[PDB]
Every structure is written in structure tokens, then in C-alpha cells.
Amino acid sequence: NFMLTQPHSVSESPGKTVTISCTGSSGSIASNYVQWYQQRPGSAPTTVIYEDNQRPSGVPDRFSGSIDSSSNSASLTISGLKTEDEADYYCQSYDSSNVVFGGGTKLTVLGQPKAAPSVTLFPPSSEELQANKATLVCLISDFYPGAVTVAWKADSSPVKAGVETTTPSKQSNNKYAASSYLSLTPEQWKSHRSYSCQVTHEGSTVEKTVAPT
Amino acid sequence: DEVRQIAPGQTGKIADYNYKLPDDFTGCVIAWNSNNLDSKVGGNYNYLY
Amino acid sequence: QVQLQESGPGLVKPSETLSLTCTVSGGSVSSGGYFWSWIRQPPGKGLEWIGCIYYSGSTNYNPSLKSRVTISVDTSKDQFSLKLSSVTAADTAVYYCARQLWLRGRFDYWGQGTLVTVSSASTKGPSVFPLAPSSKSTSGGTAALGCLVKDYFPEPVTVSWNSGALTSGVHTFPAVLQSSGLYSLSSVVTVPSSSLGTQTYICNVNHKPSNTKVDKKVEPKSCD
Amino acid sequence: RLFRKSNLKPFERDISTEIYQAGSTPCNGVEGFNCYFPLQSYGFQPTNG
Q: CA-nearest residue of chain A to C47?
């Protein structure tokens, strides 16, 4: 029942000194070796310090750790924060034949330029209609800020059923992209005269329309 | 009025912020009056500090 | 030096045996007197220790994962494999195999993480419907076309345009859960309208979990 | 407020906007050296812990 308590989020400006803690509940922190791992997102974890004072060959000297056995806490001290230091930190223990890791420390990171919300529409294809299904796809791209509201329209009546939209995602050109999908039956697509997608972005509204042709 | 500040072992507002003079200063300082060329009517503010 | 790589399926249906094999390149399992371990990490969560093995039959497992971990070592093939029984939807984690120089201390080398996120056994292929551009689909001197990837399970799908020859203007969107279990996404590219009727655009949607590759040509809409 | 000359009496408000000698070098409203201000900004963020 031995667990390591670690602060979930730690924020500090680069160039300063910060302390990351790792507190053990039942067993004393000085009983077993404590190991810190610095793991980049989407990458394998890498040992950043071990033996509670020993730095591996390759890491900078700023990654220094200390042990406070009175408070049952393991402290890792970082001096002079940099850009590459923004990663997850986990503390390892062993207890008794059962390796126990830490909760994890997240480092807070730090605005894209504004852009016009280009909107495109396509009607459902004939191949999809032959499969007894219909889907209207609304796309929002090359825009900023990433706070857009989509509202499907059936001629004049708004549509909510079957509406699926995607959260904005950053593009390569420092802009954002979004999507919206409206699943419909083949009868409902041809029931109304026209279907339109309205995109609201910073007050301005860009509307495209399609019709069954 | 700031030509007296340029010496090894002085404290003020220009030497300590722009060009400090160390104790082992074997440099050699020459200056002259050039008001007829370095200044003009209407306010010559081309130089900064 | 030595390097560890993982293999096996990156997915497993619920309530079934999981099979992940991590092999060793540039080293020997038995020689050196070291240890092997499996460590998993859920997305957005901390690292979790599964178990450790020796090149002999010595095994120890986590109390939370006790009686569910079966790890074996075969020296002839120079690899070690772990078997997980009764997998659920909460076992979605990034599995790492790591060399252990010191059992109660630090690791030295971490293999690349073969993520396994799967919660159901739908295993449905990706429907690829063309997104025909038209006069109302263009705004100015440029037009847009694409393909719709709808009603597939599970993540992910890779979509490429003209076998990867077209990359400029290509936007891949993250999938969103539908009203009934499955996901949906699309991938589109912005093209000038002058080459709409003179250039052929084909989307290549690949779904490795369902072993389905679909190529769909994109053409301008024909009024009927 | 982070920097102060000395202790202050309880139930007293300090609104002195003056650059204190936090560092070694003298700093009593002058520019001096190592003069970090008693008044610093916060680090508030809604996405913290």
C-alpha cells in the first residue's frame, strides 16, 4: 500500500529555480532508491537522475536531487529552466518486490495570428446514396481564434439530430482547422429543397449552401 | 559634464551602465570639442544612451 | 550497443488474451545477469509497473495486476513476451519493454512505445465516400475536394493523396465519436479550380486493424 | 509585494512604490545595480492545478 505522491502541475518561468517533490505514504523515502524519469510527449521515457544524487552521463548538471527522510519526501531541484525541459516527470520506488512509480509532474507551456474562416461544403455522393445513407460535411479551415460555432440548416429550420463536429486543431501555417458532419437518411436529404451550413467566427458569419442536383 | 566620470574607480550613471573602467586600466583617453559638427539647430537627438 | 523493439498486435478484443513480444538486438538475454520488465502508461496518466522477469523462471507481478500477467523468456529466439488475460476497456496504455541493469533501481534503455488503445470489438472498415467539388464548393480562385471517412472502428486511419505525392494543402482532421459508437473524419486538399477537370485526385484511406485499403477517385459533381 | 526594508506593524497597509535594496548594491529609489522591484506580477491561469 506504498504510493508516491507527486504534484500534478508545476509552473515556472525559464531561468529560475523550481523544486519537484515526491512523497511516500507508508514506507520511508530513504529506504529505497528513488529514480526520476523525464519523458517527452510521444516519446519513450529517459532516466534523468538516479541513486538520489547521481546524474547520468549526458544530462546537464542542473538536474540535481535531494532526499528529506524526515518528511518522507524526495526532492528534485531544477535550476535554469529551458525550452527542452518541458516534459513529464515521474519518481520511481521499489518497496518490496513491487516497483511503484509516481503520480507525474506536468510543466505549463507558455497566440496564433488571426485569420479568415474559409468554409467549404459538399453534398452526399451518389455512391453513399446507393448505400442507403447520406452525410453532409461542413469544413472550417485557415482560421483563428479556434472558437467557432456550427449550425446546420434545412432550408430555414435548424438541424441538431445527427450533427457531429470536431474541435479546432492547429494547422501547419499557424492557423486552425475544423469539421462538421450531418448524418441523414436518403429521404431526408431529398425532402428539403436546400441544405446549408452556417459558421460563426468573431461575429462574422460565413454561409454556404448545397442542393440536391 | 560626464568627462570626469570616465576614470578607473568612479560611480555614477553612465560608466556603470555603458562602459565600466576596471582597476587595471592601461587605456588612454582623448576627447575634444566638436559642437560645430555634432550638434545642430532645432534639436539634435540622433544619439542615444 | 543494445536496442529493444516490440512486436505483436497493437490491439486486442475485450475479454481476450493479449500478446506483446519484445525482442533484443545487439545483446544477449541470458548473459550479463540483468532483468527485464514491462511498463505501461495510459495516455495522460502516469507510468504503471506491470511486472519483472529474469532469464530464469523468477517472476514478480504488481498486486493490482496479480494472476493476470504471464511473461515468458525464450533464449533461443533472443526475446521475451508477456501475456495479459481478461483485458478490459481500462487497459488502454502505452506498453514499454525496458532493460533493467539494477532491479530495485534505474533502467537504462526504454524501447519505443507500441500503444494499445481499444475498448470494443466492432472492427469495422472505413467507408470512403467522395466529396465532389462544385461551383458552391469554391470561394475565389481556389477550390476544395476530399473524401469522407465514416463509420469505422477502431482508431486510427491513414489517408494519403495521390500515394503521398500531394501534401500541400492537405488537412487531416481528428476523429469524433458518432451517435452510435463509431467514429468519423475526413481529409481534404485545397486546389485551384483550373485543374479540376484536367487532374485526377484519388484518396488512399488505409485501415490496418480491419486490413482494408480503399482508393476512391474524386471528380466534380455531375448534375442529374 | 515581495521586497521590504524591514518588518511592518500589524494592521498597516504598505503602498510604497519604491525600488528596494533587495540585492547587495545600494538601491533606495535609484537605478543602481541588482534592483528587482518589490511589486511583481502574478502567474494566475485557469488551467493550473
A: A101
